[PDB]
Ligand binder design. Structure first.
Ligand SMILES: Cc1cc2nc3c(=O)[nH]c(=O)nc-3n(C[C@H](O)[C@H](O)[C@H](O)COP(=O)(O)OP(=O)(O)OC[C@H]3O[C@@H](n4cnc5c(N)ncnc54)[C@H](O)[C@@H]3O)c2cc1C
Ligand SMILES: Cc1cc2nc3c(=O)[nH]c(=O)nc-3n(C[C@H](O)[C@H](O)[C@H](O)COP(=O)(O)OP(=O)(O)OC[C@H]3O[C@@H](n4cnc5c(N)ncnc54)[C@H](O)[C@@H]3O)c2cc1C
Ligand SMILES: CN(C)c1ccc(CNn2cnnc2)cc1
Lengths: 588, 588
């Protein structure tokens, strides 16, 4: 059992030292490597259980049973005297640099998972390249290093969400005694875009500095895997070349889809364009009903826009539908309009974007409702949020042999391995995994440690908590109510729930019975918490701590016996008692 | 062991039905019982693992072994046939109202614990009186039903904290693109107090309605326990009378202390007065360094006041001192002045309070620093926050036999029982317990269930989480870092820590490395999390969820394997890696 772990670690590591904490001969070698500025993995054999068995099994590669032993790319290099002989003869640097390949690791894609995989691999001596290239949108929008979240995703959207929230802050301040007139204050879109884009630019720059200070080679070029170990690159001048790597990580992400209808690509935009748009969108139509669509429609309305959402069927497909409907009712009562059971047919241009004076165009949208009735209205901006997809034909040559699924995502084992033994995939293109930035970052960091440091820890993809940052935020961990009932049967499911009102909302005269939370529990398993759901302010900060308890198997009793922090919204989870089966009202 | 429980349940329960879930004869009794508006506990013997043995032991009381069995105040009443006979003969109401005492329960104190104990007892048929009286402050301040938190504690102070937070919201709004000018906006204290007091008034009313809807007798009179079952009441006309009860719950809380210096009582105020003060305090001296003192100074400063805190020795004695100092430093960087190592000697009056034109007076404060140098300065308002204390001498005739510790608090067993077998104590006066509203509420509700419904669950007072609502909030759960080291030794303690910056602070140009969090772990117990500490916005919402995981025995590995929610502050707890031993900087 242990023998095949050691073969795997020795064959994959770039520079690895087998050591012991107590040994000073090991200390002698560590310092030689530190002074020579050689980075490497170290496996302190006294700090592991089967450590005495590994010391003996090392001899299969080296013919010695003692410590230290140093390896470079699968090859035994020496004990303390032999490495010191290489240092003293200036043979060391050429030994640790000799490789069959240009790089130990090539990462295709410089986003959340790719940059994390890259930086972590370089820590343990892997010679690493990171490739990133941002294909422009149809109107030519492009951005810097860091991926979807940093440039056109979580970071800009939560910053605009905050701008929206500050509007109700201004309203609330009058009731708390501040002398301002909310009625006489307006919002400047381009001022906000300049602040958001300036922060994004400091992140582009930070990532490039991080790569340089880890000796990671960053190539702003489009990557294409033509064979298991060969990557073809194409730079800004359209110059083609080929580099080789031992291990390959695909981390190229996704991009927004367009519907197959006239005018969409020509006259619409997507979220890729929204976050650096130079003019205010004006009267906007959002087509779609995913979290992206609702989040954007949500802050556009809070900033003062005339906003409409076109919903084919339901909101937030895949999420708990009671919570989804409460999310949607809140938005509808605070000035988002909904065109229900409606799909688009064409977009007609009426005015071209006034690019000089910084103004939007004018469009005609024509569609029909699900019964047959017709839709026709004019908008200044149309935003499509109808899903995202990878396009691995751009990245991946079919002859290489990497299996994809029917959606176009990479089929992987539970350690991210593809059907080609040295190629891996992480992040949104890994089939079946939650498409979330913290997931990609963990997957990337954990894989790098297994490749180049002898680690065994895998990424746990179950019960990952989410938050939808609509004007009233919605946090969740675990199963929706309908999924629990389906998997276990309604007679085994108990649901504790309650409305609540933040203390902050009392003096501000906000609504009484709009915030809501519930625990979905399995009776036959000690009333285990199957899913947690909360609609209210700061839902992400509320939910996050409970994801730890859910990972650990929390039960209703665990929540009961824990004491609240007062006054908070979150404490309401510690005294839930009304069940749905009882019929009692959840109001306060 | 099972027989000792049954004898205790039968003796103290007011009205209790022994039953089985599927039992048409039991259902026949239940329908008679609540038709006549008779509240009662019910124990469904088929829901307990040793319900077979319990059913037998009932015969020691009734001479029968079947269900249903109905008891009133320790006396067996009958089976199905017997109870119905009493019903159709109009004898039943007189049976269930038969008592040696006026009340099954007398609660002394109408605050967090007492209201919660009383309402819960009444649900199971206990005849209940709740006594509450508010001794006016030296200047005459008084308030309504609900206790310290509702009237002069958590509720008014967090509303005022929120008023203070809204000032940085208005500042942050400009950077996010709103057109207002923060420097042209001022705060109106009396407008804020009016809104706060109107919300407090609606809580006062809501509690009176809740007691009436539960058939609890509310007496607005001061109570005094003259013998184990005898309570002397004095009403608002000084009429004196005596009521008896079977069980007595003491829940009278504490009040603010005054230092024994000239002018303190005469010319200063406490928090009891601050939350309904008709005029803005103006230039203010806060004397003390507890969380009350720091919280009040904190929002006074955010609302535009000139504020000084006089600190005898250290900030937040009893909390983790590295966190206390970071809390202090932030306040001092945001306009709170500190007079360190200093104590007051006397307050002298320069102007009487102008009650007509609604203005504070003027005071001269004189004191000294620990090295002997002199303090002398003028202030409009002086607020004493130098601790709180009970005064059970005005509650407890010494001859009754209730033992007290050296601080004046009631020594109780771990089921809240005092040295007199039918008297219990809950809330702030229970010696050695955390002094917090959720603790009082939970202790009161669980005690009621044990007295009157046969419950056995005890209140768990370990690892109760806290939040200090200073201008930058500080949430904690478990041991301080210095306590962990003292109990286990520095060599067995490992601390993971990190700075962070809320995403909301980027565009608003706020501080880079002020927010801070750490996890205090025990190496020899599989890196068990001993204490969690976070300084930052929404610290209470952040901390609460983690209290469940700490209750469950969480380890560093459990935090590591849980994925974060992005973008949130709380997610930083899921990727901590820098140790204090390592000497690496916690900046980002
Ligand atoms: C509007 C929006 C909001 C979101 N909000 C959140 C949120 O609040 N929280 C959250 O957890 N997640 C959020 N997400 C999802 C999150 O952004 C993704 O899960 C994450 O970015 C995926 O990381 P990745 O490393 O798999 O891919 P990416 O971050 O997309 O990185 C892939 C990178 O590789 C580049 N690339 C592609 N092909 C090539 C090639 N051939 N050669 C070189 N480079 C290439 C891409 O251009 C891109 O730079 C949001 C997404 C969107 C669209
Ligand atoms: C400024 C301040 C802020 C606080 N903030 C928080 C916070 O954020 N979170 C938190 O958890 N805790 C907070 N606390 C603490 C919280 O208020 C107490 O822990 C809690 O109220 C204790 O409840 P109790 O039932 O023990 O006492 P109380 O709530 O004080 O109730 C006792 C009641 O009995 C009355 N009484 C006294 N003697 C008699 C008598 N002889 N007859 C009749 N009635 C009598 C008293 O007047 C009072 O109304 C704060 C306290 C203060 C002072
Ligand atoms: C002693 N055990 C474990 C027990 C006994 C009775 C009940 C039901 N009566 N009740 C009401 N509120 N809590 C309990 C539940 C548990």
């Amino acid at each position: 059992g242990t023998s095949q772990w050691l073969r795997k670690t020795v064959d994959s590591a770039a520079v690895i030292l087998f050591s012991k904490t107590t040994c000073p001969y090991c200390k002698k070698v560590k310092d030689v490597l530190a002074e020579a500025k050689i980075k490497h993995a170290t496996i302190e054999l006294d700090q592991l259980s089967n450590g005495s068995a590994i010391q003996k099994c090392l001899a299969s590669f080296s013919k010695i049973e003692t410590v230290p032993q140093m390896f470079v790319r699968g090859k035994f290099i020496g004990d303390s005297q032999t490495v010191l002989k290489y240092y003293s003869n200036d043979e060391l640097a050429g030994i640790v640099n000799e490789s069959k390949y240009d790089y130990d690791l090539i990462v295709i894609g410089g986003g959340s998972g790719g940059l994390a995989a890259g930086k972590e691999a370089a820590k343990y001596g892997a010679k690493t390249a990171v490739l990133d290239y941002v294909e422009p949108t149809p109107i030519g929008t492009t951005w810097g290093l860091g991926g979807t979240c940093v440039n056109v995703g979580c970071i800009p959207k939560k910053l605009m969400h905050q701008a929206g929230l500050l509007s109700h802050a201004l309203e609330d301040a009058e009731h708390f005694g501040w002398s301002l007139d909310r009625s006489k204050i307006s919002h400047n879109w381009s001022t906000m875009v300049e602040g958001v884009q300036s922060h994004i630019g400091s992140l582009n720059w930070g990532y490039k500095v991080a790569l340089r200070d880890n000796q990671v080679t960053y190539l702003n070029a489009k990557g294409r895997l033509i064979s298991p170990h060969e990557v073809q690159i194409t730079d800004k001048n359209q110059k083609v070349s080929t580099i080789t790597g031992n291990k390959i990580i695909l981390a190229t992400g996704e991009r927004p889809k367009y519907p197959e209808i006239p005018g969409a690509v020509e006259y619409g935009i997507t979220s890729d364009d929204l976050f650096s748009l130079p003019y205010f969108p004006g009267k906007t139509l959002v087509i779609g009903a995913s979290y992206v669509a609702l989040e954007c429609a949500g802050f556009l309305a809070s900033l003062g826009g005339d906003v409409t959402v076109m919903v084919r069927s339901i909101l937030l497909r895949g999420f708990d539908q009671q919570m989804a409907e409460k999310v949607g009712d809140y938005m509808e009562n605070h000035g988002v309009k909904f065109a229900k059971l409606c799909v688009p047919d064409e977009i007609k241009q009426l005015k071209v974007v006034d690019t000089e004076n910084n103004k939007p165009g004018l469009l005609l949208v024509k569609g029909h409702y699900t019964d047959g009735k017709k839709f026709e209205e004019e908008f200044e901006t149309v935003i499509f949020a109808v899903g995202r997809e990878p396009q691995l034909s751009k990245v991946l040559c079919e002859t290489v042999g990497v299996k994809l699924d029917k959606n176009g995502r990479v089929v992987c084992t539970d350690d991210e391995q593809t059907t080609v033994s040295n190629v891996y995939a992480i992040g949104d293109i890994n089939a079946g995994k939650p498409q979330l930035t913290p997931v990609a970052i963990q997957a990337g960091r954990y894989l790098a440690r297994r490749l180049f440091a002898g680690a065994t820890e895998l990424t746990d993809y179950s019960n990952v908590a989410t938050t939808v940052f609509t004007p009233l935020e919605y946090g969740a961990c675990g199963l929706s109510e309908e999924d629990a009932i389906e998997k276990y049967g309604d007679k085994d499911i108990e649901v504790y729930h309650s409305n609540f009102k933040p203390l902050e909302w009392t003096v501000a005269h906000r609504e009484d019975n709009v915030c809501y939370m519930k625990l979905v529990c399995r009776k036959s398993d000690n009333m285990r918490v199957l899913g947690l759901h909360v609609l209210g302010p700061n839902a992400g900060e509320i939910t996050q701590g409970y994801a730890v308890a859910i990972k650990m198997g929390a039960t209703k009793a665990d929540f009961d016996r824990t004491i609240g922090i007062h006054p908070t919204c979150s404490e309401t989870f510690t005294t839930l008692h009304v069940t749905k089966k009882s019929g009692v009202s959840p109001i306060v």
